[PDB]
Structures are given as C-alpha cells and as structure tokens.
C-alpha cells in the first residue's frame, strides 16, 4: 500500500521569558528518526533512528538551519498572533505545525499536508489541491490574504512535490529493513 | 478623548392622538461608539425597537437613531434613556409633543 | 527534509 | 373579455359530466359560443358550438349523440353536457367566443379562448408498481428500471438512495390503454461500473404507500 | 374537412419562419391562425388569411391563395416557440377544421440526433407472463421525434405507447416508447427493431 | 448641483474578544443603501434602499468579500496601531475609515476622499491631489511613508475615478426616482 | 506584449457570447475592453478585468485569471455586433497592447459558405504585358473570410490584394481578391488556385 | 460631457509633414494624460503615442518613434500629434483619447472616452483613366464581367447594356493596390444558355478622369 | 461599490 512522512512542530511562548521553547519531531511512517528540542543542549538536529545519521554533515547542518529558522518564524509569529487576538504577553500560547507528503507503492505522489493551529484551535490549513488556503477563523484570513499575495500556495506545493517526496523516497531506501517491518 | 452624546427625542410625523406615529431617539456627537438607548412607554422599556446603523460626521463623532412604532395618547408619556461612558447615570429625555 | 524557508503570519 | 371553464376533473366511464364556461366582458346574448377540446399531446379539436340565440346545435361527428351543448342567456354561462363518458373524452376543454356577432352558424374565427377545464376518465384505483431490472448491454453501458402499471401519478426514482444523480435520466410515464401508467428511469455509466459497483433503483409511489428497491445486474 | 400543417418547423433566430396550411381549395376559405404555448390557451394571431389583431406584432403575416394558406413570422424571436394551428370552416361539411399543429422551433442549441437505447423484456417480467420493449429516446433537438416498430422487417401497430418529448436537465428533449407484447410473440420472431426519426434522419436499434 | 457617495467604516476592538465589532454604512447623497453588521447573523452585505437589491448576486457577493476583507484588515490594523502607540490590550479602541467620490452635474469626476482616524483623532488623510498623503501625527508617518512604497496614492485614485464614479453613476440611474427628489 | 483575440465570434440572439483575450501572464495585468461598431470610435465596456462603466448594461461581464481574459456578453442583442479589442499595459515593454480584435456577429440570417468564381488573366491584358487574377467571393455569412493563393500547390505571398468584406443587397457579405502576376509567371505554372476559408471550411477554384 | 474633436488630417503625399490636432472640452484638461491611437482601415487598433498631464515626458510606440512627436497645449486644451516624413504606412485613422485616471506618470490605465478621429491617407496621387479588360465566361453548362484596373481617384460606376441589365449584377469593392491606384471588378451572371443571343457591354464610368469605357465581353 | 482591496498601517 502507501507510505508517509510527517514533521511535527510545537512552539509554546514562555511569558516573562526572552524566547519560547521549541520541539521538532520527524517521523517516517510511524517510526521516529529526528528530533530538535530548543531546550536540548545540542541546538542542532539530533538523530533518533539508526538509519538517518548516515546522512553526513551537509544534512544535519541543513536541517538545523531549516528548523532553527522555523523556530525563528514561529517566535515572530507568536507576537503577530498576539496582536491579532487582542491578547496579552502574560499569556502563554501554543503554535503547532505539521507538514508532510504521501508516496505510493511505486514511489508516487499521493497527498500533501500542512496544517497550522494556534492554541489547539485550527488556524490555517492546506487543502488537497495545494493551491488554496483554508482559514478556520478570521485571524487566519489576514494571514490567508497575506500569503496569497506572495504565492505561498506554490512554494509550499514545491517543497511537498520536490524535496519532500525525494526525502521520503531516500529514507525508505536507507532503512529498508527498519521501515518495512511488521 | 471622548465626546458626550446629544439626545433629541421627536416623533416621525407631527403626533395626533390615536394615529400610528413613530418615536425617534437620535443620539449624535458622541465618542467612543458604545451607547445604550432605550425608549420608554411610561418608564418601562419598549421592546419592539430597532436602530440605525453606525455612521459618523465630519468630526468622526458617531450618531444613531433608535425608533419604535407607538400610538400616543394624552396620558401615555414616552421617553428615551441614553447611557454612555461619559454619562455616570443614564440620561433620560422624555418625548415632548412640541419639541 | 525540513522546509527550505517559512512564512510569517 | 373573459371566459372561465370549470366542472372538469376525474370521472369514470359511462357517467355523465357537465362543463360550464362563465362569460364576462362582452354582450353574451349577441355572440356565438364554442367548445374546443384538446387530447393531451395532440392537436386542437372542435367539439360543439351554438349560435347567439340557441336556435340550432352544431355537432362534430366524434361527439354527436353523446354530447349536447347549450347556453343560458340570462346567466352568461356556456354549458357542455357529456353523456356516456369514454376514455376518448379525456382532453382539456376550451371555450371560445365567436368574433362576429349574430352569426347564424359557427363559421368565423373565435377569440379569446378560456384557459379551459380538464376532463379525464379512467377505471381509477390506486395500484402498486411492478419494478423490473433493465439489465446493461452485454465503451459505455446503460441500465435502468421499468416501473410498470402504477396508478395514480407519480413515481419518483432514485439510485443508491440518492447517492447517484450523474447519468441518471427519468422519462415521462405513458398512459397505456388499460389506464395504468408506465415509467422507466435509467443511468449510464462506463462499461466498468458493473463489476465493482452495486446499482439499486429506489422507486417510491406514495399514493399506494409502496417502496421498491430493485438491484440491476448484467445477464 | 382535411387541412394539413407541417409537424414542426425549426428556424434560426431573427430569420423568417414560414408555416404552411395546405388544403383542397383552402384559398377560397377564410383561414385563421392560433399560437399556443405550453400551459396556456390558444391565442388568435392572424384572422381571415392575413389580418392581425390589435396586440399582435406586424412581424407575423398571413397568406392564403389557391391551395395553400401560409403563416409567416418575419424576424423570428425566441418567444415564438409554440404550436401553431390553422383554422378553416368547411362549408360543405358543417365542421370547423383545425390543422394538426406545427411546433415552430427557434433553436438556442444546435441540432443533435437522439441517443437510442432499446431494452428487451426482463427475464423477471417474462415469468410474470408479460413482455415490454422499452425504446428510450433522449438528447435530441428540436423536440420532434417519431417512433416506428419493426418486427423482423415488418411494421408493428398495436401494443405501442410513446411519450410526448419533454425538456431534460440540459433543456434537450427526451421521450420513451414502449411496445407491450406477449412473451410468446417476443420468442416467435427472430428480431425486433425500434425506428426513431428526428429531422429527416432515422436511427434504429 | 452635484452628487456623492460615501462609505463609513468603523471597527472597535472588544477587549478580551478575539475579533473586533464592525459596522459599515453606505450612503448615496443622503439615502442609505447598504449595511454590513458584524454582530448580525447574516455574515453578508444586506440591502438598505429600494433600488440596490436589483443588483444581483454578483453585487452582494462582491460587496461582502470587499468589506469582510476590510474588516479583517482593521483587525490587524488595531493590533498594529496598538504597537505604534505603546498601548495595552485592556483598552478598547476605535478605527474609522471614510472614502468616497463626488460626481458632477454631467456624470463627471469632481473630487475624491479617503480619511482615517484612530480614536476620533485624525490619523492619515488623502490630499485633493490624490497623489499626496498627509499624516496628522507621527504614527501616521510610518503609515504615510509605508503607503507611498506600494503607490497606494494611485490605487486609491483608481478606485475613486473608476468603480466609485461608475458605482455612483450606476446608482443615480438605478434609483433615479429616489436620488433626485426634493 | 502579444495579446491574441479570436478573429470573429458568431452567436444566436438571446444566447451568451464569449470573447477571449489570451496572453502570457495577462491575469496579472489590468485588462480592459473596447467595442467598436463600424464608423464610430471605440467604447469602454469593461475595465480592470471585471468592472463595468456607467452606461454599460450588466449583461456584459468581464473576467481575467491566469493566462486568459474573457469578455462575456449574456443575452446578446443585435446592437452587440461590433469588433472588440482588449487593452493591457505591458509593464516590461512601455507599450499599450491591444488585442487583434474580434468581430462579434449576432446572426439574423443562417450561415452560408462562400461562392467562389475565379477568372484567368484576360487575353487583352496579357498582350499589355501584365496578368491579374480576379477571385470573386460572394454570398457568405458572417462577414469574415480569408484568402490563400496556390501556384502549383505552393503558397503565393506578394501580388495579392484583398478587400474587406461588405454587405450585399441581401445582407450577406462579399469581397474580392486580386493576384498580380507577370505573363511569364502565369505561363510558368500549369494552374493557379484561390483558397477562401469561411467558418473553418475552405472553398477553392 | 467629455468631448474630443480631431482635425488637420486629409490626403497628403509621402515625405511631407503633417500636424494632427485634438480639441478637448468637458474636463480640467491640465490634469489628465492624453493619447493618440491610430487604426489602419479594416485592421485592429494600434497605439501611437501618449503624453502625461503636463507634457513632461513623451511615450512613443516603436512603429512611429523618431518620425512622430506628440505635444500638448494646456492653455488651449488641445492635443497635437506631429507626423514627419509621411509614408504609405502612416495611412490610418488617428483617434485621440483621454486617460481616465489623473496625473498618470505613465499611460497604463484604460482610455475613456475616445474621439471620433481624423483620417490620414497618403499616396502618389494623380488622376488616371481605368483600363477595362473583358472577364470572359467559362465554356461550361456561367458568369462574366469586367476588370477595371488602375484608376484614381474613386469611384467608378459600372452598368450593363447602358443600364438595361440589373438582374445578376454585382459590383465588388475596389482594392488599393500597392501602387496607390484602385482596381475594381464587376460581373453579371446569366443563363448558360443564350450567351450567343444577347450582347454584353459593361459601361465603366470614371468621372474623376472624365473617362467612359464601353467594353463588350464574349467567350473564348 | 466597495474597494477591491485595502491597505494596512
């Protein structure tokens, strides 16, 4: 049948604190392989499976910046959403991101995913057709029309069908024993 | 900064006893926008009341008109109560037959 | 592979 | 000028029926009046007519002896009497006002025409419909249901309890010579839907409180 | 007592339509014309060969000479779609003679031949001692079809019922024609055929 | 003499409420014709004159999105101005926008308008030129120089002489009975 | 800087017409539309993709997305017959770009293919040291034709002149096409052919 | 009440210079940009040049650059288009139009309204008699006519049998050949039969050159 | 007619 890859981000603002805490957990199927914790002493994306650390330094230094910067965005995003909801800096709020792609039995492309949630409530989400955005409330609509102006529908679609499908394909072949067990 | 509401109470047409007229309360020149306005048939709050939609003038001061169908007699005396942030106690302006 | 860039709200 | 027919409806064969046309907006006592009927799905047909006074009575051959046309000058109403009703009398009955006055015979054009009344005779009684599967052709494949011999109108056909509407086509019902209606309703799909999908037409005839679910399948 | 009209006439919008009313010495009778749209009463549109009532527009003109009365609609509109009946008075018959009616079609669609699907009697109906051939006609324009049944290259008269065409979802027309047979007659002959004709061309199954 | 059309927008932040309340009132000369109330159950631009509801769904669907989005913008504008003035989330503030156009006796174009006020005090305004902005205070200068960057002087000028004059022209003939009375 | 329109569009009265203005990234440009009837100046009917001017009825609507702008005229009247030009501004060219123009025809007649009558160069003209082929095109509708010349299955460029179609007495259109040759070139090849195209179909001689 | 009136056009010879003028009324002309857009007869619209409200800059289409120069006089409310070194290609109708939006630093937005325009036609003009050749009929069980070549100016009028034939007659439009001379043909269809019996004389008349030609057409 | 899009401060 099918396969999948999912990235899970979680950003909680620690009020009275300089910068929030960040936890990044990456899965192949349902077998974790990478982790990036803000509170970790690493400040670097650490391996979590036996088959992902054969990717050399060009990969770990890459994945570090890509979610160091994903933490950057979500830190500035908590301040943006705090202005969207008339909320105060004493409050501690959460942002959760999950994006991924589905390959088929023959290495195909089946479905892409990206959903955003502010304080457990749906915020903005990416549909089936990776061209339109869906805004749960109003505050996700001032982010919707801000994203339709810069063609964020495309640049998310390009990661899904570009680096995501070629990442998931290479990992399912790196750990062929680990990732096809039962 | 705040402005306190002016209240004018009048009937839509010159009132005549026993004929359906309409009771208007027109609050204007106030700021901010939050205002409470009721019409009173002898001190009780008249329920079947609608209002206009919030517009503003040259000085950005808001204005609304709350109106109700009413049939005035000589014993029935009608009034308009308007509470505001600039008003510690609700103003009451009673509907005059000749104002 | 994490995403190349990200967008702010 | 206004003409208003009434008195029609559903009758049974052998009975007698009285149609009436109420007139206003012209000197009814001075004009000829006419009845013209129309078999559903067919052309216009002249029935009978009467001059301004009621002296004579002109009859078409198809309704002579059985029909009698009359007028009441004091009531401004035109009448058509039907005796020994038959299925052939099933038609809409229009009433029309001879244009010219004092016509001793109905020769000239008649306007305006009333909206008319409908006379329909049958051996009426409610009946459940028999549903037979119209199997697909042994490209594109078509299939449907045959809803035979129900009464009265109407039946409603749905496919997969309303979950299929694309390619669905319900046809009008025929009134067969027995007086019972007959309707078919089909749905085209590719010549692959037969081995993977089920196909159940759900006919519903509320007059008989009947519901039928018939599965259609090849061969 | 026989005055004959064409069954249907299709015309492009804005053109000049022409409906004929042929009859033996119809030129010496006073011809009238009525237009009937679905659900309404007939309306006088032309009287005494060519004259128009007050409200009728001058685009519509009449004609009647020799052996053919003719109704002409100049600058055809979409709203002229209806049935048209001519009217004579047969002096030597004591019968007012209506024509068969002519469906004047001002096409908004192009002209498409109908899809014919013929169904044999189901095996279940055969064990009910009945047999009914269902001939299905759909997706044609203009809305004018005629159904003929052939039992082994031989015509079939009785046992045939046919609907009047009606507008579909896509505003094309559709109708069905049934041939009720006994289960024996369905087995007697080797082949049955449904002949549907629409705008001169004939399709079969 | 001449004619006119005015739209009056008002967005007030209900503190402790995720989205602020919004009321939009449109007038032609001195005859109101449209309404959009935030607290209304409609979520749709409602007619208010006898001549505007003959504009079909292309109009109500248009006018809804244009001020559904105008309400969204003011949601981020109240939060942005909350940061310009160093103000807190317990406060309840108002934003008022008025833009419109004046046609002449012969359907001409005579004068355009757009004015913004934060808490009843003048903020940013549009000069007659329609090519210059005037910033009443300081916070309107970070909005003045921000708007000249996207040539907002023009794209307001195009609405004023385009759809506004042809909207006002279309209404003066649609309700020609209502709008030339005395 | 290239915006391409269909050459002509024919539509029945009361139907819905559709004129396109295709162009690379035209969805990000502000498209406008002008309607030019014979003898008059262009008139704005749609500006900024979909907005309508004051006098324009709501039947005419605009559209512009991706790479295809669309002018839609619902319930076409006879007064909608004209040429239609779209208008963009190529930012990266400093050129305002009109489309090729589309002659929208709301037909009142039916559609008729052209009658082509071809004349060889006269003997008198050959002895005048010139040769002129007269290709005559008449009785077509709508008024939009294209002429191609074949000298021994090969196209002919220069020496060709062609009129713009114009209305006849019967309101069909007609035009003429001349091919100037030298008397040697007329004798060099064995046969000449005039190709007239009308409504997709081509007529030759 | 925006009103635009072109003038100054007409018939010129190649190489000469020409000045078109567009008189404007019904708006503060000093506040809007103005444009010239020409149209070759029977062809699409073609943008020529445009000028902002003040005359600061001057936008040229490439097809008329260097040869054309556009200017405006705000004190007279008049727009001018100067054409230098006229060519046969400058033969077109010249519309002048007023940019809808004000103060446009570039001619980007729609043009409303358009003036009726003026017509500029250039040629190596001189009056010329028309050459008349018989277009003989085919030998098949047929049409015939006349070819009226290389005359100037318009128009010629063709009649058959001194006007005694009207049935079957059809005159076609004249082409403007590359020389600048017009050329017209005119035919008449008849019964394939009876060609022999009847005489066939087309009567071409070119009043501008005071020419009358009567040419008989006959088969083979 | 309300404005197509709007500007933020």
Short mmCIF file of C-alpha atoms in Angstrom, two decimals, chain D:
data_model
loop_
_atom_site.label_atom_id
_atom_site.label_comp_id
_atom_site.label_asym_id
_atom_site.label_seq_id
_atom_site.Cartn_x
_atom_site.Cartn_y
_atom_site.Cartn_z
CA UNK D 1 -63.45 39.71 -22.42
CA UNK D 2 -63.16 36.72 -20.07
CA UNK D 3 -64.18 33.06 -20.37
CA UNK D 4 -63.78 30.66 -17.42
CA UNK D 5 -64.26 26.90 -17.70
CA UNK D 6 -64.98 24.60 -14.77
CA UNK D 7 -66.70 21.33 -13.89
CA UNK D 8 -63.94 19.08 -15.23
CA UNK D 9 -61.89 16.67 -13.18
CA UNK D 10 -61.64 12.89 -12.85
CA UNK D 11 -64.74 10.90 -13.81
CA UNK D 12 -65.46 7.28 -14.55
CA UNK D 13 -66.58 5.90 -17.92
CA UNK D 14 -70.31 5.62 -18.50
CA UNK D 15 -71.05 8.55 -16.20
CA UNK D 16 -72.28 11.95 -17.32
CA UNK D 17 -70.46 15.24 -16.88
CA UNK D 18 -71.38 18.92 -17.12
CA UNK D 19 -68.82 21.52 -18.17
CA UNK D 20 -69.55 25.22 -17.69
CA UNK D 21 -67.96 28.36 -19.15
CA UNK D 22 -68.64 31.65 -17.36
CA UNK D 23 -68.55 34.70 -19.63
CA UNK D 24 -67.97 38.40 -18.88
CA UNK D 25 -66.75 41.38 -20.86
CA UNK D 26 -68.99 41.20 -23.97
CA UNK D 27 -72.65 41.08 -24.95
CA UNK D 28 -73.02 37.33 -24.42
CA UNK D 29 -76.60 37.46 -25.74
CA UNK D 30 -75.35 38.58 -29.19
CA UNK D 31 -72.38 36.28 -29.93
CA UNK D 32 -71.88 32.64 -30.77
CA UNK D 33 -70.06 30.42 -28.27
CA UNK D 34 -67.95 27.33 -28.86
CA UNK D 35 -66.32 24.37 -27.14
CA UNK D 36 -62.95 23.15 -28.44
CA UNK D 37 -61.12 20.26 -26.74
CA UNK D 38 -57.53 19.02 -27.00
CA UNK D 39 -56.38 15.45 -26.40
CA UNK D 40 -53.15 15.63 -24.34
CA UNK D 41 -50.15 15.59 -26.66
CA UNK D 42 -52.35 16.14 -29.73
CA UNK D 43 -53.85 18.99 -31.74
CA UNK D 44 -56.88 21.18 -31.21
CA UNK D 45 -60.29 19.61 -31.83
CA UNK D 46 -63.72 21.24 -32.23
CA UNK D 47 -66.45 19.65 -30.10
CA UNK D 48 -69.71 21.59 -30.42
CA UNK D 49 -70.93 25.15 -30.84
CA UNK D 50 -74.12 27.18 -30.51
CA UNK D 51 -75.20 30.43 -32.24
CA UNK D 52 -76.06 33.61 -30.35
CA UNK D 53 -79.64 32.53 -29.61
CA UNK D 54 -79.55 28.74 -29.17
CA UNK D 55 -81.70 28.00 -32.25
CA UNK D 56 -79.58 25.09 -33.54
CA UNK D 57 -76.74 22.94 -32.22
CA UNK D 58 -73.73 22.05 -34.36
CA UNK D 59 -72.05 18.75 -33.52
CA UNK D 60 -68.80 17.20 -34.57
CA UNK D 61 -69.23 13.57 -35.57
CA UNK D 62 -66.97 12.23 -32.82
CA UNK D 63 -69.23 13.58 -30.04
CA UNK D 64 -72.63 13.64 -31.74
CA UNK D 65 -75.48 11.92 -29.92
CA UNK D 66 -73.44 11.71 -26.72
CA UNK D 67 -72.73 15.44 -26.25
CA UNK D 68 -75.20 18.33 -26.09
CA UNK D 69 -74.14 21.99 -25.98
CA UNK D 70 -76.40 24.65 -24.52
CA UNK D 71 -76.30 28.25 -23.36
CA UNK D 72 -78.07 30.28 -20.69
CA UNK D 73 -78.51 33.85 -21.91
CA UNK D 74 -79.79 35.00 -18.50
CA UNK D 75 -76.77 33.58 -16.63
CA UNK D 76 -73.94 34.35 -19.13
CA UNK D 77 -72.68 30.77 -18.95
CA UNK D 78 -71.94 28.25 -21.71
CA UNK D 79 -72.57 24.58 -20.98
CA UNK D 80 -71.32 21.31 -22.47
CA UNK D 81 -73.19 18.14 -21.47
CA UNK D 82 -71.29 14.86 -21.76
CA UNK D 83 -73.30 11.62 -21.79
CA UNK D 84 -71.75 8.14 -21.74
CA UNK D 85 -68.24 9.26 -20.87
CA UNK D 86 -65.50 7.25 -22.58
CA UNK D 87 -61.69 7.23 -22.42
CA UNK D 88 -61.78 9.12 -25.74
CA UNK D 89 -63.29 12.13 -23.93
CA UNK D 90 -60.03 12.54 -21.94
CA UNK D 91 -58.92 16.02 -23.03
CA UNK D 92 -58.83 19.68 -22.00
CA UNK D 93 -61.99 21.58 -22.93
CA UNK D 94 -61.57 25.20 -24.05
CA UNK D 95 -64.44 27.65 -24.51
CA UNK D 96 -64.19 30.41 -27.12
CA UNK D 97 -66.16 33.50 -28.19
CA UNK D 98 -67.09 33.94 -31.86
CA UNK D 99 -65.58 37.24 -33.00
CA UNK D 100 -68.54 38.47 -35.07
CA UNK D 101 -71.99 38.99 -33.61
CA UNK D 102 -75.30 37.43 -34.69
CA UNK D 103 -73.57 34.63 -36.61
CA UNK D 104 -76.28 32.11 -37.56
CA UNK D 105 -73.58 29.41 -37.86
CA UNK D 106 -70.10 28.99 -36.32
CA UNK D 107 -68.02 29.92 -39.37
CA UNK D 108 -65.76 32.78 -38.22
CA UNK D 109 -62.67 32.82 -36.03
CA UNK D 110 -63.20 32.59 -32.26
CA UNK D 111 -61.16 34.65 -29.81
CA UNK D 112 -60.46 34.82 -26.94
CA UNK D 113 -60.10 31.25 -25.64
CA UNK D 114 -60.55 30.39 -21.99
CA UNK D 115 -57.86 28.58 -20.05
CA UNK D 116 -60.17 25.57 -20.09
CA UNK D 117 -61.07 22.64 -17.86
CA UNK D 118 -59.65 19.11 -17.92
CA UNK D 119 -61.88 16.04 -18.36
CA UNK D 120 -60.18 12.69 -17.71
CA UNK D 121 -61.98 9.35 -17.39
CA UNK D 122 -60.46 6.06 -16.20
CA UNK D 123 -61.13 2.88 -14.22
CA UNK D 124 -59.33 4.60 -11.38
CA UNK D 125 -57.95 2.85 -8.31
CA UNK D 126 -54.53 3.10 -6.68
CA UNK D 127 -52.08 0.38 -7.71
CA UNK D 128 -48.59 -0.65 -6.70
CA UNK D 129 -45.96 -0.57 -9.44
CA UNK D 130 -44.09 -3.64 -10.64
CA UNK D 131 -40.36 -2.91 -10.96
CA UNK D 132 -38.23 -4.90 -13.39
CA UNK D 133 -34.45 -4.53 -13.87
CA UNK D 134 -33.36 -3.21 -17.28
CA UNK D 135 -30.03 -5.04 -17.39
CA UNK D 136 -26.99 -3.45 -19.10
CA UNK D 137 -25.89 -4.29 -22.62
CA UNK D 138 -23.80 -7.47 -22.78
CA UNK D 139 -17.13 1.90 -24.10
CA UNK D 140 -20.37 2.98 -22.41
CA UNK D 141 -23.05 0.85 -20.76
CA UNK D 142 -26.60 1.88 -19.89
CA UNK D 143 -29.10 0.44 -17.41
CA UNK D 144 -32.27 1.36 -15.59
CA UNK D 145 -35.61 0.33 -14.16
CA UNK D 146 -39.03 -0.32 -15.69
CA UNK D 147 -41.88 0.88 -13.47
CA UNK D 148 -44.97 -0.76 -14.94
CA UNK D 149 -48.67 -0.35 -14.27
CA UNK D 150 -48.99 2.02 -11.34
CA UNK D 151 -51.78 4.45 -10.57
CA UNK D 152 -52.14 7.30 -9.96
CA UNK D 153 -49.23 9.61 -10.75
CA UNK D 154 -46.45 9.96 -9.84
CA UNK D 155 -43.49 7.68 -9.13
CA UNK D 156 -40.10 9.04 -8.12
CA UNK D 157 -36.93 7.13 -8.97
CA UNK D 158 -33.61 7.45 -7.15
CA UNK D 159 -30.40 5.47 -7.46
CA UNK D 160 -28.32 4.25 -4.49
CA UNK D 161 -30.74 6.07 -2.14
CA UNK D 162 -29.97 9.38 -3.87
CA UNK D 163 -26.17 9.00 -3.85
CA UNK D 164 -26.11 8.77 -7.68
CA UNK D 165 -27.57 11.52 -9.87
CA UNK D 166 -24.96 11.88 -12.62
CA UNK D 167 -26.00 9.98 -15.74
CA UNK D 168 -29.47 9.38 -14.26
CA UNK D 169 -32.38 10.07 -16.59
CA UNK D 170 -36.05 9.55 -15.71
CA UNK D 171 -38.50 9.53 -18.58
CA UNK D 172 -42.16 10.57 -18.72
CA UNK D 173 -44.79 7.95 -17.98
CA UNK D 174 -47.04 6.55 -20.71
CA UNK D 175 -50.75 6.09 -20.05
CA UNK D 176 -51.22 2.64 -21.54
CA UNK D 177 -54.65 1.74 -22.91
CA UNK D 178 -55.51 -0.04 -19.62
CA UNK D 179 -55.45 3.25 -17.68
CA UNK D 180 -52.28 2.35 -15.74
CA UNK D 181 -49.12 4.43 -16.06
CA UNK D 182 -45.71 3.09 -17.01
CA UNK D 183 -42.36 4.81 -16.48
CA UNK D 184 -38.72 3.90 -16.99
CA UNK D 185 -35.66 5.58 -15.48
CA UNK D 186 -32.08 4.80 -16.46
CA UNK D 187 -28.50 5.71 -15.63
CA UNK D 188 -25.49 5.46 -17.93
CA UNK D 189 -22.03 4.71 -16.51
CA UNK D 190 -18.78 3.37 -18.05
CA UNK D 191 -18.66 -0.29 -19.04
CA UNK D 192 -16.64 -0.88 -15.85
CA UNK D 193 -19.18 0.10 -13.14
CA UNK D 194 -20.83 -3.33 -13.49
CA UNK D 195 -18.12 -5.41 -11.84
CA UNK D 196 -17.23 -3.05 -8.99
CA UNK D 197 -20.37 -1.08 -8.09
CA UNK D 198 -23.85 -2.02 -6.96
CA UNK D 199 -26.88 -0.45 -8.64
CA UNK D 200 -30.23 -0.21 -6.85
CA UNK D 201 -33.03 1.99 -8.15
CA UNK D 202 -35.43 3.04 -5.40
CA UNK D 203 -38.87 3.79 -6.84
CA UNK D 204 -41.30 5.48 -4.46
CA UNK D 205 -45.05 5.67 -5.15
CA UNK D 206 -46.60 7.39 -2.13
CA UNK D 207 -50.24 7.05 -3.40
CA UNK D 208 -50.04 3.28 -2.83
CA UNK D 209 -47.53 3.65 0.05
CA UNK D 210 -45.14 1.41 -1.87
CA UNK D 211 -41.34 1.49 -1.80
CA UNK D 212 -39.35 -0.81 -4.07
CA UNK D 213 -35.58 -1.38 -4.09
CA UNK D 214 -34.52 -3.40 -7.12
CA UNK D 215 -30.88 -4.22 -7.84
CA UNK D 216 -29.84 -4.15 -11.51
CA UNK D 217 -27.14 -6.53 -12.75
CA UNK D 218 -25.97 -7.87 -16.13
CA UNK D 219 -27.18 -11.04 -17.85
#
